[PDB]
Amino acid sequence: LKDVVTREYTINLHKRLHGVSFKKRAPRAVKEIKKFAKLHMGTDDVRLAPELNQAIWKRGVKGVEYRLRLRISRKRNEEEDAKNPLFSYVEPVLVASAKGLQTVVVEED
Amino acid sequence: ARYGATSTNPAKSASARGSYLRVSFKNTRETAQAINGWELTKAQKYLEQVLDHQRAIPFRRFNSSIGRTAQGKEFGVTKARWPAKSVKFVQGLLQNAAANAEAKGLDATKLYVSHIQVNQAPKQRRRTYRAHGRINKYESSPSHIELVVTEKEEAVAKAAEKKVVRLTSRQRGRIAAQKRIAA
Amino acid sequence: RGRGRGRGRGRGRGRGR
Amino acid sequence: ANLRTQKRLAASVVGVGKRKVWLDPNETSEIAQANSRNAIRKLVKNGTIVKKAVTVHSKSRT
Amino acid sequence: SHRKYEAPRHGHLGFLPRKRAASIRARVKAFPKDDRSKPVALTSFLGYKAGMTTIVRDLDRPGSKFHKREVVEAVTVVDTPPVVVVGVVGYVETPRGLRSLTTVWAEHLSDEVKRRFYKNWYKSKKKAFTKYSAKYAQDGAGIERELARIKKYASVVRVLVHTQIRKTPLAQKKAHLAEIQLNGGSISEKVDWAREHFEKTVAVDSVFEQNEMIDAIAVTKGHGFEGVTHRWGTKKLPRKTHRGLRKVACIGAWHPAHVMWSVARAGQRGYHSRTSINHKIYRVGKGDDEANGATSFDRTKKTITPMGGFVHYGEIKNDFIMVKGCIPGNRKRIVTLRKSLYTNTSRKALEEVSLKWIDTASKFGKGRFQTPAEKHAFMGTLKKDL
RNA sequence: GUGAACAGCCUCUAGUUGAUAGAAUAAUGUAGAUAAGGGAAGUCGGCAAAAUAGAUCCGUAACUUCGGGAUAAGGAUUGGC
RNA sequence: CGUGGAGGUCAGUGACGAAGCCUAGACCGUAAGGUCGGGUCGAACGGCCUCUAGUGCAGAUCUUGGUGGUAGUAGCAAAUAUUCAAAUGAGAACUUUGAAGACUGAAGUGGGGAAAGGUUCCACGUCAACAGCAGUUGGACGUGGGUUAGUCGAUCCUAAGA
RNA sequence: GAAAUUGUUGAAAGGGAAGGGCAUUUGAUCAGACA
């Protein structure tokens, strides 16, 4: 069931970085998003866009936003047939504030 | 040549070895003892799960102060680890030993590992620096790895010893007394 | 040798009288 | 590739430090072929290497 | 030589070893002695600790200064949904002790009881008690022959009950099975009382009542590995102490050349089985009646759950027992309430407790309001509602 | 830039991002901290820690080799517009 | 009884296997020891009558060399901090590039010299050893390239002195 | 290409040491005379 789909999620990143060291919050937010994409998509290879890395590191190590609006798209794997046939690409969504939005399935239009 | 103590048929067997490999001797011995006697097709699948931390290698002899885990319940032990460096070397000889099988003409569905042996190699010497201007040794423990895969066979050997009968003069007259009376 | 391994001079340690 | 030596030559040719030398990541094939200082001047002319102007230190609050 | 001065022992030596309990449900080591004249009734009950609140009541204690005066006391709230009898067990007397003889189960068992017998219930075929149900397919002689053996032998009879976990806000989904001894007379009537109660529910007011002194049996809240300073309460070393100060200086003498069992050492703290006695019942509430938190002196329409519900537990919707004082164990823990083993007449009991007010403010902070209508009256109107 | 200041703190030019990592957050530690009421009852011993702290104005004893003691002791003020 | 060598002898043994080594295999002697079978090995060795001595080891905190238990244990925690993508490659937490976040805060982790080191400087190729993890990288390994003065110094003068 | 030390295989034993002496059982193994 490859069934390539693209959805837009809202991750509560405030409750995932609770009681975390101030010099490890931004590095651990990268690891939490890859864990977030593994649960909802099932793929093991999760690629984060460099623009989304700028969003996490916007306000230093101890400056991660409480909520982030993401866009996770599941694609097909190429270039010498790695272990999984599908991977997840996570992109940021430029909105005013990610406060009050739910999951919306974006069709391939 | 000149392998270890093997009791298999050399015609239906294939061998491979590796010398002066810079891997831990204690870590390699536990992985060799956790794979001996297994089928070759199940040996390669089990070693891949160790790299993914799905199954663990049981430590039986060199297991002092090792942290215990829940993955040792399969082998009935408490202390187990995941020696990833030694598995990548052990599975590198399993691929080489399996490749020699089709060259000899062995069907891969029946190969099981029958003999695997690991022993110490000459050490590589370095030095560390301690307090009060002292110098101690700082050495690696390499190992020589060798293994033999053999085809599995069934129904081997009937026709045991003949068990020659020794009878005395009185016992022959006793066994001939029940014969003339009953069965 | 170094600042450790102190045995000899002492305020109230070994090698007294 | 290894463009460590190309960034050192481009710093002295342009006249700024190594922190202000920019190399095109999509054009990394022909930068590795520039081994001399004469070829480094050639890449600046065609925009392969830019100047990467200074960070603004405003004195408006002062 | 002598110490330098005499000092009391640190800790109690009877509570040893301080190891982790063998189960999350504490065992009932003793039961009240049977009286043949009394009717057949339960000796204990099973419930879940919800939380704690505050009660205001009149003190009736002659010779005291607060006589005909109001006092505040801390009480515990234990959610006690009705338990279901699923079987009976008989125990015969042996020179080596008590020995179980015959266990007879009910014909139909709910999925909560079957959840207890499986560790992988989602993967199993749920075949538990399937061939045992064929004993009821006949005229009933297979069960009756096993039941008539309990009337002749088995001088001690215990009943099998389980909690209704689906009636609680917990997400644990598995019933707790336990043995409760029946205290009555005429051993034949004990198994007739249990036979009629198969697949039947008994409430909490049929076992306990108002102003009754009971005992609480539960497992202490765990704390993991703890040092010797908090596990035993030993004196801290001075600030000048090298190699640490939260330790014990002298752990023993030269002779005997061994560490004694009576010295304080670091180890596991908490998660022990404790039995607290002499706890008075202040309220026997109902789950089918509104205004559980109401009183004949307050008259306001409100139930016992605080504002926003109990912290980490939820809301009470079943019968409950209010117990004065503290109860071992934290919230969401299975507890076993047991009647007293002796008749107490110290005048701390035998008094009729009539409350005046029940505190129901929010336990998630410094609550200022009891009912949601009180918050709207004091604060008037807001931007969100209007 | 702040300020008396080559003090501490932040930034520009310039230079680095090199010190084995990952996962959890038991005891005991090392380093940094906070504590109601009492205020040295602790201890060989105020050890350690805490308090005081810049500037301006007021005020300043015994004693003295008349030079000092003296920032004596003890008080008040401090932003922004 | 045994060891190294010497005189005499057994017209001694031996590449059809001397010496040595291994052998819960066998025999003889109270014992020190001697003999045989089997395996391994490849060129010299023994019995006896006498001579001779650097002639017999479990110890000397013995000497030299080698190897263990401890033990995959102690430990690899100062100097605020790294993250994403791409490229290369058998292989990338560590290489290169881009982007982001930071630090040294100008008595600097900046730019130059003296003493000292001596090719560490630069390029290409390489990853067995070294870089107490790793490594495609390196002050590493291999092969080559590089230091241009009438004005900068030495050279000259004298000081304490020699 | 010995010993210390180590791996594999085979055999045997093991309730807070192991090793030893006398005697026998059990298992393995060996010899003699067959005159």
Short mmCIF file of N, CA and C in Angstrom, two decimals, chain E residues 256-308:
data_model
loop_
_atom_site.label_atom_id
_atom_site.label_comp_id
_atom_site.label_asym_id
_atom_site.label_seq_id
_atom_site.Cartn_x
_atom_site.Cartn_y
_atom_site.Cartn_z
N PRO E 256 31.88 -8.19 65.38
CA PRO E 256 32.13 -9.21 64.35
C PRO E 256 32.55 -8.63 63.00
N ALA E 257 33.34 -9.39 62.25
CA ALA E 257 33.89 -8.91 60.99
C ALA E 257 32.87 -9.03 59.86
N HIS E 258 31.66 -8.53 60.09
CA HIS E 258 30.59 -8.56 59.10
C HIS E 258 29.70 -7.36 59.32
N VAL E 259 29.02 -6.93 58.25
CA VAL E 259 28.03 -5.88 58.37
C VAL E 259 26.74 -6.48 58.90
N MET E 260 26.21 -5.90 59.98
CA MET E 260 25.01 -6.42 60.60
C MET E 260 23.78 -6.09 59.76
N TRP E 261 22.71 -6.84 60.01
CA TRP E 261 21.43 -6.60 59.35
C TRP E 261 20.68 -5.41 59.93
N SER E 262 21.12 -4.87 61.06
CA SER E 262 20.41 -3.81 61.76
C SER E 262 20.97 -2.43 61.46
N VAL E 263 21.88 -2.30 60.50
CA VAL E 263 22.43 -1.01 60.14
C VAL E 263 21.64 -0.43 58.98
N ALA E 264 21.66 0.89 58.86
CA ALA E 264 20.93 1.57 57.80
C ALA E 264 21.75 1.57 56.51
N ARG E 265 21.13 1.10 55.43
CA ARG E 265 21.81 1.00 54.15
C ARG E 265 20.88 1.52 53.06
N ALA E 266 21.48 2.00 51.97
CA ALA E 266 20.69 2.51 50.85
C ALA E 266 20.04 1.37 50.09
N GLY E 267 18.93 1.69 49.42
CA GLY E 267 18.22 0.67 48.66
C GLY E 267 16.89 1.19 48.15
N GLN E 268 15.99 0.25 47.88
CA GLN E 268 14.68 0.57 47.33
C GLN E 268 13.79 1.20 48.40
N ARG E 269 13.14 2.30 48.05
CA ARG E 269 12.19 2.98 48.92
C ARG E 269 10.82 2.99 48.26
N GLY E 270 9.79 2.66 49.04
CA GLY E 270 8.44 2.64 48.53
C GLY E 270 8.08 1.33 47.87
N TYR E 271 6.84 1.29 47.38
CA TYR E 271 6.25 0.11 46.73
C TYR E 271 6.27 -1.09 47.67
N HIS E 272 5.97 -0.84 48.94
CA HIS E 272 5.81 -1.88 49.95
C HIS E 272 4.34 -2.04 50.31
N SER E 273 4.02 -3.20 50.88
CA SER E 273 2.67 -3.50 51.32
C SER E 273 2.50 -3.02 52.76
N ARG E 274 1.50 -2.17 52.98
CA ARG E 274 1.23 -1.60 54.30
C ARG E 274 -0.23 -1.83 54.67
N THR E 275 -0.48 -1.89 55.98
CA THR E 275 -1.82 -2.13 56.52
C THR E 275 -2.10 -1.10 57.60
N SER E 276 -2.87 -0.07 57.25
CA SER E 276 -3.28 0.95 58.21
C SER E 276 -4.67 0.64 58.74
N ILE E 277 -4.83 0.76 60.06
CA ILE E 277 -6.05 0.37 60.74
C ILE E 277 -6.67 1.60 61.40
N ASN E 278 -7.88 1.40 61.93
CA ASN E 278 -8.63 2.41 62.69
C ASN E 278 -8.88 3.66 61.84
N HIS E 279 -9.64 3.45 60.77
CA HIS E 279 -10.07 4.52 59.88
C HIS E 279 -11.59 4.58 59.88
N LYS E 280 -12.13 5.74 60.23
CA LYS E 280 -13.58 5.91 60.34
C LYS E 280 -14.19 6.29 59.00
N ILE E 281 -15.36 5.73 58.72
CA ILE E 281 -16.08 6.03 57.48
C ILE E 281 -16.93 7.28 57.70
N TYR E 282 -16.77 8.27 56.83
CA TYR E 282 -17.52 9.51 56.94
C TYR E 282 -18.71 9.58 56.00
N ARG E 283 -18.66 8.92 54.85
CA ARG E 283 -19.78 8.95 53.91
C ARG E 283 -19.81 7.65 53.12
N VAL E 284 -21.01 7.10 52.95
CA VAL E 284 -21.23 5.98 52.04
C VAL E 284 -22.10 6.48 50.89
N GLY E 285 -21.46 6.92 49.81
CA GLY E 285 -22.18 7.56 48.73
C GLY E 285 -22.78 6.58 47.73
N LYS E 286 -23.63 7.11 46.87
CA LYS E 286 -24.31 6.34 45.84
C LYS E 286 -23.96 6.89 44.46
N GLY E 287 -23.86 5.99 43.49
CA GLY E 287 -23.55 6.39 42.13
C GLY E 287 -24.79 6.69 41.30
N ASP E 288 -25.95 6.26 41.79
CA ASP E 288 -27.22 6.50 41.13
C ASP E 288 -27.98 7.67 41.74
N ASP E 289 -27.34 8.44 42.62
CA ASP E 289 -27.99 9.56 43.29
C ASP E 289 -27.16 10.82 43.04
N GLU E 290 -27.83 11.89 42.62
CA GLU E 290 -27.17 13.16 42.40
C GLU E 290 -26.97 13.87 43.74
N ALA E 291 -26.10 14.88 43.73
CA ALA E 291 -25.77 15.70 44.91
C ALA E 291 -25.12 14.84 46.00
N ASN E 292 -24.08 14.11 45.60
CA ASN E 292 -23.29 13.36 46.57
C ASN E 292 -22.53 14.29 47.50
N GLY E 293 -22.03 15.41 46.97
CA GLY E 293 -21.34 16.39 47.79
C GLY E 293 -22.24 17.28 48.62
N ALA E 294 -23.55 17.17 48.43
CA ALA E 294 -24.49 17.96 49.21
C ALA E 294 -24.60 17.41 50.63
N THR E 295 -25.04 18.28 51.54
CA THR E 295 -25.20 17.95 52.95
C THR E 295 -26.51 18.59 53.41
N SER E 296 -27.05 18.09 54.52
CA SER E 296 -28.28 18.64 55.09
C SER E 296 -28.09 20.03 55.68
N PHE E 297 -26.85 20.50 55.78
CA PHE E 297 -26.56 21.87 56.20
C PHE E 297 -26.11 22.77 55.06
N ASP E 298 -25.67 22.22 53.93
CA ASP E 298 -25.23 23.02 52.79
C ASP E 298 -26.34 23.20 51.76
N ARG E 299 -27.02 22.11 51.39
CA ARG E 299 -28.23 22.06 50.58
C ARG E 299 -27.97 22.42 49.11
N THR E 300 -26.77 22.86 48.76
CA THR E 300 -26.45 23.20 47.38
C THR E 300 -26.32 21.95 46.53
N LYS E 301 -26.74 22.05 45.27
CA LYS E 301 -26.79 20.91 44.36
C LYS E 301 -25.42 20.71 43.73
N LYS E 302 -24.63 19.80 44.30
CA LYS E 302 -23.29 19.53 43.78
C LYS E 302 -22.85 18.14 44.20
N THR E 303 -22.09 17.49 43.33
CA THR E 303 -21.51 16.19 43.62
C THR E 303 -20.10 16.35 44.18
N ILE E 304 -19.49 15.21 44.55
CA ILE E 304 -18.23 15.23 45.29
C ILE E 304 -17.01 15.53 44.43
N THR E 305 -17.11 15.40 43.10
CA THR E 305 -15.91 15.63 42.30
C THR E 305 -15.55 17.11 42.30
N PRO E 306 -14.26 17.44 42.38
CA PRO E 306 -13.84 18.85 42.41
C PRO E 306 -14.02 19.50 41.04
N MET E 307 -13.73 20.80 40.99
CA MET E 307 -13.79 21.53 39.74
C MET E 307 -12.72 21.02 38.78
N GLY E 308 -13.13 20.68 37.56
CA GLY E 308 -12.23 20.06 36.61
C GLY E 308 -11.94 18.60 36.87
#
